[PDB]
């Protein structure tokens, strides 16, 4: 019912719908980077697609994504991530039983 | 093109969205309408949900949808539904192959 609750649930509910679509065995191709820059634009956030070694592949809003939420990812974190306000949210994507990047919301 | 395309890509996308959000086993429940509530808001789209009878069951701006877009969706018609110049797009919603309802979108 809180304003933040609501805003932390939308973008979970964002970011996982987002990985469900990716290709995760398959990640720097360009099917997937016109799926992240489309759904971009449409659901009103900025996402990004990280490898495992912390580089950023594509985003919707330019191949960028904020240098302490990588590496909260690549050191195991996900879900929403520890700015300071400005919200974000991180996922792991595994193709075949082994991890092959993530992606990184960010709301906008 | 190409303002219009963008705001049609963009009701797409969000129309996909939110019809992956719904049970569709259930769609006349209160989880559901919340999700509607919630993410119509978070999306500044109107969107509404209508049973496979045309009735409306609830929407993010009130329990309404355009008669005739209605009855193109029970008439089997999806995509871009878009009358001259108000932009609608449409799913169906489906639980085990069946048909539940639909899903109506208008911009906002």
Request: charged letters at 25%; glycine letters at 10%.
């Amino acid at each position: 019912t809180s304003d933040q609750r609501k805003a932390e649930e939308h973008i979970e509910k964002e970011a996982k719908y987002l990985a469900s679509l990716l290709d995760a065995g398959n990640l720097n191709n360009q099917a997937n980077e016109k799926i992240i820059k489309d759904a971009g634009g449409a659901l009103d956030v900025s996402a990004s697609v990280i490898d495992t070694d912390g580089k950023v592949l594509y985003g919707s809003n330019g191949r960028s994504a904020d240098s302490q939420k990588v590496q909260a990812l690549v050191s195991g974190h996900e879900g929403i991530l520890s700015t300071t306000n400005k919200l974000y949210y991180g996922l792991s994507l595994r193709s075949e039983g082994e991890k092959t990047g993530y992606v990184l919301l960010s709301a906008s």
